Amino acid sequence: KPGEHDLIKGIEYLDKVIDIDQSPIGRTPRSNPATYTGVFDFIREIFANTTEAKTRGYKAGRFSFNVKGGRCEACAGDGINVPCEVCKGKRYNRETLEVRYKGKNIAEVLDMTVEEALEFFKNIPRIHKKIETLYDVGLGYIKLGQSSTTLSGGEAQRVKLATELSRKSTGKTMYILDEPTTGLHMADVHRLVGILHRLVEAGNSVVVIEHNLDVIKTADYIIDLGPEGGSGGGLVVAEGTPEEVAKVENSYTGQFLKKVL
């Protein structure tokens, strides 16, 4: 159910909506970038579609380290109990680590970096799109199987951003981002701004709730709100291009933009 409003006009001009919310990211040992971005499902399906897996009667859930169908029971699928010795902490039993796609099993695929997976999966388009987005957000050094509990705040935020921005664009979709700069250095902000502007140039519309002036100064339109927080706010104090907002005397964002532009 939406919030309290009378009506919204202009929805017929859009065909899709993609939203990145301002919420915490859950950290679990069962999660990694590959599972979060949804590409591990495609990788598992590809592995289960091979001739060896068909001969051995394996399915997509066999190659999941969270499923008790092919995971090692000594380490309970975690690899560490002290590293495991029977399965060498790979979380898969010896039989699962025998189905090889292009001469490589699931553990080495999980052990790839994003840049390596770009070349390895350069032919499968569904996997390639997600890997390319992960590279675009600047996570090329990260491993596809690194634990989410060992991810930094900026890395987790960029994984979430890549997950949501690696979706199909019909040329009439609406992108909503709620402060996507949290934990990002000025270079990661540059990368994100470039990605968003390419999306806009592709014919889409992007709405960003931002506090960063580097992002703000590149925006075509600005809708300031205030003039304060809580019961003292909730009114539009400025509306227009960043220069027009900067010309407004009572707008804090305009005051801070005057020294930037």
Partner 1 sequence: TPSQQTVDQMVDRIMEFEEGTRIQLLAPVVRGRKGEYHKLIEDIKKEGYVRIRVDGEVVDVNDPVNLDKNKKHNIEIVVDRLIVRPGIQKRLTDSIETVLRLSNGILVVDVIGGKEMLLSQ
Partner 2 sequence: MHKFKLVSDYKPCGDQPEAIDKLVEGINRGYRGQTLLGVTGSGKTFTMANVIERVQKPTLVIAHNKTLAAQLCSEFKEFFPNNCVEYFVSYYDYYQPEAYIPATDTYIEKDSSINDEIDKLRHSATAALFERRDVIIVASVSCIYGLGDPEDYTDLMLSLRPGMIKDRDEIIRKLVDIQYERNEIDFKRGKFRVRGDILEIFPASSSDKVIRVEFFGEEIDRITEVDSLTGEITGVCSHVAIFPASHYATTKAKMQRAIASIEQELEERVRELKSQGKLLEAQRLEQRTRYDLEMMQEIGFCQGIENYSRHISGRAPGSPPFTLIDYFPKDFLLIIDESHVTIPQIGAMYNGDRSRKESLVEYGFRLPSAFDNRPLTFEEFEKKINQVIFVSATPAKYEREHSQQIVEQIIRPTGLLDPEIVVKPQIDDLIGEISERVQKNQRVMITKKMAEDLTDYLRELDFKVEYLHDTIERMEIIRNLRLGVFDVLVGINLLREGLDIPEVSLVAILDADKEGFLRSETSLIQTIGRAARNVEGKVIMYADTITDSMRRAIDETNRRRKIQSEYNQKHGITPK
Interface residues with Zn ion (CB under 5 A) are: 72, 74-75, 84, 86-87
Torsion sign, CA atoms 229, 235, 241, 246: negative
Interaction residues for partner 2, span 17-46 (CB under 8 A): 46
Provide DSSP, 28-90.
-TT--HHHHHTHHHHHHHHHHTSHHHHHHT--GGGG-TTSTTTB-TTTTTSSB--B-SSSTTS
- Tell me: does residue 101 bind partner 2 (CB under 8 A): yes
Query: Does 243 contact partner 1 by CB under 8 A?
Result: no
Interface residue with partner 1, options 19, 45, 73, 243 (CB under 8 A): 73
Smallest distance, Å, CB 47 to partner 1?
Answer: 17
> Residue 70's CB: how many other CB atoms inside 10 A?
21
The reply to whether 183 sits near ligand ANP by the rule CB under 6 A is yes
Contact between 199 and 167 under an 8 Å Cβ cutoff? The reply is no
Q: Does 63 bind partner 2 (CB under 8 A)?
A: no
- Residue 137 touches ligand ANP, criterion: CB under 6 A: no
86 binds, among partner 2, ligand ANP, partner 1, none (CB under 5 to 8 A by kind): partner 1
102 is a contact residue toward partner 2 (CB under 8 A):
yes
Q: In a 10 Å sphere around its CB, with 0-12 CB exposed, 13-18 middle and 19+ buried, how is residue 82 labelled?
A: exposed
Token pair 């992108």: residue: 175
Among partner 2, Zn ion, ligand ANP, none, partner that 97 touches (CB below 5 to 8 angstroms by kind):
none
From candidates 95, 228, 243, 244, binder to partner 1 by CB under 8 A:
95
Cross-strand pairs, 238: 224
Contact segment (CB under 8 A) with partner 1 among 90-98, 138-146, 185-193, 196-204 equals 90-98
For residue 155, the partner it binds in partner 2, partner 1, ligand ANP, none, with Cβ less than 5 to 8 A by kind, is ligand ANP
Burial status of residue 126 (CB atoms within 10 A of its CB: 0-12, 13-18, 19 or more): middle
With a CB cutoff of 8 Å and minimum separation 6, the contacts of 152 are 183
> Binding of partner 1 at residue 56 (CB under 8 A)?
yes
Asked if residue 41 lies in contact with residue 201, where contact means CB atoms within 8 angstroms, the answer is no
Residues in the interface with ligand ANP (CB under 6 A) total 7
Q: How far is the CB of 48 from partner 2 (least distance, A)?
A: 10
Burial of residue 260, with CB atoms counted within 10 A of its CB: 0-12 exposed, 13-18 middle, 19 or more buried: exposed
The residues of the shown chain that bind partner 2, judged by CB under 8 A, are 46, 49-51, 54-55, 57, 101-102, 123-125
